[PDB]
Amino acid sequence: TTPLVHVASVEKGRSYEDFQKVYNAIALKLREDDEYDNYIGYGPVLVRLAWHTSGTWDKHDNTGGSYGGTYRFKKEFNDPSNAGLQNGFKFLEPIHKEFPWISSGDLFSLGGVTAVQEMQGPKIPWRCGRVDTPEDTTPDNGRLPDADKDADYVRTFFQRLNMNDREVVALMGAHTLGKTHLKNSGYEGPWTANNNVFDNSFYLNLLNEDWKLEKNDANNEQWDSKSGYMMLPTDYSLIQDPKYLSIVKEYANDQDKFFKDFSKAFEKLLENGITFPKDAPSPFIFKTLEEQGL
């Protein structure tokens, strides 16, 4: 099967203003629906949705990826690895209803960008142009990562997404948001206390907390700290591996570096598999509600 080329196609007549309006709608709803998940808000689940819809990509044949917006199809929607993401999708429904012109891929990815920025994270340049593809293009389940593995697994896994050591450690920093839910993944607990604030706390906790390898109620091992935080075996592997450890220490000691590196890696993640024409508009950098005085 010749590997497909997915060329970005700007939604007819749309420009920055249009997308800023969608961003604002998402941001306003994030502010409004703050009760979700014990007052954590929808920010974290939206970031996870953006990552999962993009993370199915395979550099070898360009299958999966954010372009097609295939999460809308049952096969992907029902992927066990996506348990819980239905919440993010339900949140996006009113947004898509108001702006029916935006593609699913653009909406899923924009939701992640909006959530990160609204949660005081770095600005993440974003490009429009993803086009909805048929149900038959939906990637099979099993392309997202397992959490009960080690550094070797993580390193190998991310090579399929064309991510190097630095990009992997930076991307994992997204765990500074939200928490694991036993019912969804078989893991329970937050990585950080301020889990709706995008900062480098994930790295600081990993390095400074006293972790104990314990078993949760789902009979799965996870690292727990007296402070009430947790780390998946894959998160902990970042301090077990010498190469990953140096980068963890770097981000734990440089907030700005983490922000810049995460911004680049997250945009790359959300753009994998997409060919942007030379005449395509430059990446958009949306203003937060706060910057707009809204």
Q: Is 130 in the site for ligand HEM (CB under 6 A)?
A: no
For the bound state, the minimum distance from the C-beta of residue 162 to ligand HEM, rounded and expressed in Å, comes to 13
Q: Is 91 in the site for ligand HEM (CB under 6 A)?
A: no
For the bound state, the minimum distance from the C-beta of residue 9 to ligand HEM, rounded and expressed in Å, comes to 26
Residues 18-47 as x/- pattern, contact with ligand HEM by CB under 6 A: --------------------------xx-x
Give 66 or 201: the residue with its C-beta nearer to K ion: 201
Instruction: Give how far Cα 85 sits from Cα of 52, 78, 210, 265, 273, Å.
Output: 9, 10, 31, 21, 22
Binding residues for ligand HEM, rule CB under 6 A, total 24
The window from 57-65, 80-88, 189-197, 226-234 that contacts K ion (CB under 5 A) reads 189-197
Instruction: Give how far Cα 30 sits from Cα of 88, 95, 158, Å.
Output: 11, 11, 30
Picked from K ion, ligand HEM, none, the partner binding residue 133 (CB below 5 to 8 A depending on kind) is none
Instruction: Give how far Cα 6 sits from Cα of 63, 66, 170, 275, 286, Å.
Output: 10, 10, 26, 6, 24
Q: Tell me which of 53, 63, 180, 192 binds K ion, using CB under 5 A.
A: 192
Active-site positions read 52, 191
State how far the Cα of 289 lies from the Cα of 294, in Å rounded to an integer: 5
- Ligand-binding annotation for 96, yes or no, is no
For the bound state, the minimum distance from the C-beta of residue 201 to K ion, rounded and expressed in Å, comes to 4
Could you give the angle at which helices 86-98 and 104-118 cross, rounded to 10 degrees?
Answer: 110
**Residue 35: partners with Cβ closer than 8 Å, 6 or more residues away:** none
Closest of 159, 168, 175 to residue 232, by C-alpha: 175
Closest of 60, 189, 171 to residue 112, by C-alpha: 171
**Site for ligand HEM, residues 171 to 210, rule: CB under 6 A:** 171-172, 174-175, 177-181, 184-185, 187
Tell me which residue has its CB nearest to ligand HEM. Answer: 178
Q: Is 122 in the site for ligand HEM (CB under 6 A)?
A: no
For the bound state, the minimum distance from the C-beta of residue 5 to ligand HEM, rounded and expressed in Å, comes to 25
Q: Is 51 in the site for ligand HEM (CB under 6 A)?
A: yes
Question: Which residues does the annotation place in the binding site?
Answer: 175
